[PDB]
Amino acid sequence: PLRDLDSEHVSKIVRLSGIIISTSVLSSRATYLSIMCRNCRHTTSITI
């Protein structure tokens, strides 16, 4: 139950029931972004 979540559940898999009362707008998260240095042209890629 949502009221029965203590600090022993932190960073652990928990199953909890409830009702959704809000769904925010989708936001864009970078999963793979190419980067380049400003005072250079060094191309690199960061993968998420």
Binding site: T23, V25, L26, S27, S28, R29, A30, L33, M36
Partner: protein
């Protein structure tokens, strides 16, 4: 530094432009138009923008098409450079007083990229997408400094600096935050030279999922669109819109150590205002020379009025003079704006009081569907705040302000509050809405023709009683209605069987491309606000009936290219009929005032517009007075 791939794509798009000659024709026409009114005035200047059909590009080069759709940042700049090179190549005659960058706009089938603000996700980023929605917010059209010109008085020299932001290019640059030059390189104070600096119009609109397709009860989704220097002011809040643009991601999304996620918006390339029913967007239609020829051909016919009257609502049986009045209101009269400032109304209002099920609402829904610009309202479903304007320090247009130069179809007119009734009183004759609220004294234009449906006091029009007791509406309000039609459901065997055979024939109808037992599909008809004249399906079985699209074309042509002038030979008939109606004792359904002289004049002008005549002849006045006498008394002379 030049790029080989960039040049290859430039030459490929140049080949594409050479293959499809319509694009040189469009660019040449734009250039000659600009040069011609440049030399004329030493009107308006057409933008350096070309509509590109994506279907033609797919036919020519499918990878170039897929590259533009999927990788616009790498394929749109080369295509724009090719178009600019082509335009400067044809520019043998330069405008009086490469160069002049030409922008591209896209149209056609987008496939999976034709989306909505709800279905536009993060995997559409950096793609050319067409988003359909409703405009909810339009920011101020603000100038953006793209080149500042300064003057150094000590040296007497003019300097300049160009500015660049992240939204002006599809590709990402190195950011160069060049400061505003407040002094020369060597210490001389600079003076900004406004009027020689370059400012580019910039607008940021918000496109939200349309109410007709957004899920019910769910919070809507919105997307930001940025318009630059020619797409600004192309739409207004509440407009249905189709924006074609590159779904871009900007900023760092909190990664750059100084946001929850990346800032995403659409760099608008094309803006199409769409026409949806009961919206504030009129219905522009393309009139080919064949269409105009057919319109003139039919206008030459004597009974064209009748042909246009019966073809309005063939599905409704009867209501023939009501259809004539509806057609005249669709045409309408011509408003008069005298030099001193007074205004004479040229819009025809119609009221239909009647028994239950005499098709008053179907005749309202038909007018809503077929009119160029029509807004549908119901009594007490929209108040004076919802009908007229509303103060939000800013004004929000109501039903009769959005329907300016249009039609307002009010169902259940009797179930309207008096607070709304007074505002309607103002809107019908003076065609204006004066707010004078919360420090906002504004006179909005509400030049709209009102068609309304109402029920009697007891729910059944008692023929024993008089109309004044059966209507229960203010007499001053009934005066504004140019034509008041009382329709009664009289049970007569001939018309009983005839209306029932019609109702069943209409119910026994099949579309050309449907099976016997196939449920007819239905779309929302999002027409773009820019092949036979007659109709195959005839519920009546008789004169010929024209198709609704052709009738809309005819109404548009007569409404936009015919301005009839009253004549003495029509004035004699109008004056005689008005004097008789005022003086003759006949127990009229509606009172006779000086407004009656002007509904005679307006109906005569509308019928003259029907015949495509530039002068109101005697026959127009006679038929106008005939319809009016029917509407007041019920005569058939």
């Amino acid at each position: 530094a030049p790029d080989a791939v960039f040049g290859d794509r430039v030459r490929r798009f140049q080949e594409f432009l050479d293959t499809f000659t319509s694009y040189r024709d469009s660019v040449r026409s734009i250039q000659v138009y600009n040069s011609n009114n440049a030399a004329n005035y030493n009107l308006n200047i057409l933008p350096h923008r070309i509509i590109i059909s994506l279907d033609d590009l797919r036919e020519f080069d499918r990878s170039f098409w897929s590259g533009i759709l999927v990788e616009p940042a790498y394929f749109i700049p080369p295509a724009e450079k090719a178009l600019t090179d082509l335009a400067d190549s044809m520019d043998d005659v330069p405008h009086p007083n490469s160069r002049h960058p030409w922008k591209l706009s896209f149209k056609g089938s987008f496939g999976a990229h034709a989306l909505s603000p709800r279905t536009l996700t993060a995997q559409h980023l950096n793609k050319l997408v067409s988003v359909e929605g409703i405009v909810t917010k339009t920011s101020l059209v603000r100038p953006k400094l793209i080149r500042s010109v300064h003057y150094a008085a000590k040296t007497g020299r003019f300097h300049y600096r160009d500015y660049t932001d992240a939204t002006t290019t599809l590709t990402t640059r190195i950011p160069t935050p060049a400061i505003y030059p407040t002094e020369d390189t060597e210490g001389n104070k600079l003076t900004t030279e406004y009027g020689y600096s370059t400012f580019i119009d910039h607008q940021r609109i918000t496109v939200q999922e349309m109410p007709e397709m957004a899920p019910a009860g769910q919070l809507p989704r919105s997307i930001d669109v940025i318009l630059d220097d020619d797409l600004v002011d192309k739409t207004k809040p509440g407009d249905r819109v189709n924006v074609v643009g590159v779904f871009k991601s900007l900023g760092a999304g909190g990664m750059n150590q100084s946001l929850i996620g990346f800032k995403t918006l659409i760099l608008g390339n094309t803006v199409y205002p769409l026409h949806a029913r009961s919206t504030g967007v009129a219905a522009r239609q393309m009139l080919t020379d064949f269409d105009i020829r057919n319109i003139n051909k039919l206008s030459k016919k004597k009974d064209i009025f009748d042909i246009l009257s019966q073809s309005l609502a063939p599905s409704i049986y009867g209501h023939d003079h009501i259809k004539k009045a509806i057609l005249l209101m669709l045409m309408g009269g011509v408003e008069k704006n005298l030099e001193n400032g007074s205004h004479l109304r040229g819009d025809i209002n119609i009221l239909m009081v009647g028994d239950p099920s005499t098709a008053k609402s179907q005749l309202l829904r038909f007018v809503l569907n077929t009119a160029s610009l029509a807004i549908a309202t119901t009594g007490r479903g929209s108040s004076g705040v919802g009908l007229t304007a509303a103060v939000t320090r800013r004004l929000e247009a109501g039903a009769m302000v959005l329907a300016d130069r249009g039609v307002v179809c009010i169902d259940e007119f009797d179930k309207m509050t008096d607070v709304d009734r007074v505002a309607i009183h103002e809107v019908m004759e003076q065609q204006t809405v004066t707010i004078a609220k919360a420090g906002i004294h504004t006179t909005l234009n509400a030049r709209c023709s009102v068609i309304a449906a109402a029920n009697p006091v007891f729910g059944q029009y008692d023929v024993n009683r008089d109309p004044h007791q059966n209507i229960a509406l203010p007499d001053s309000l009934l005066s504004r209605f140019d034509l008041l039609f009382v329709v009664t459901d009289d049970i007569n065997e001939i018309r009983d069987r005839s209306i029932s055979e019609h109702v069943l024939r209409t119910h026994r109808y099949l579309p050309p491309g449907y099976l016997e037992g196939e449920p007819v599909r239905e779309r929302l008809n999002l027409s773009l606000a820019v092949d036979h004249v007659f109709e195959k399906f005839n519920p009546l079985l008789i004169p010929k009936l024209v198709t609704i699209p052709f009738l809309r074309k005819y109404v548009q042509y007569a409404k936009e290219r015919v301005i009839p002038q009253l004549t003495q030979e029509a004035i004699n008939v109008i004056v005689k009929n008005y004097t008789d109606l005022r003086n003759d004792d006949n127990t009229k359904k509606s009172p006779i005032t000086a407004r009656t002289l002007e509904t005679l004049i307006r109906l005569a002008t509308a019928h003259a517009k029907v015949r495509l005549s530039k002068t109101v002849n005697k026959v127009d006045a006679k038929v106008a007075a005939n319809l009016l006498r029917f509407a007041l008394l019920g005569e058939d002379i």
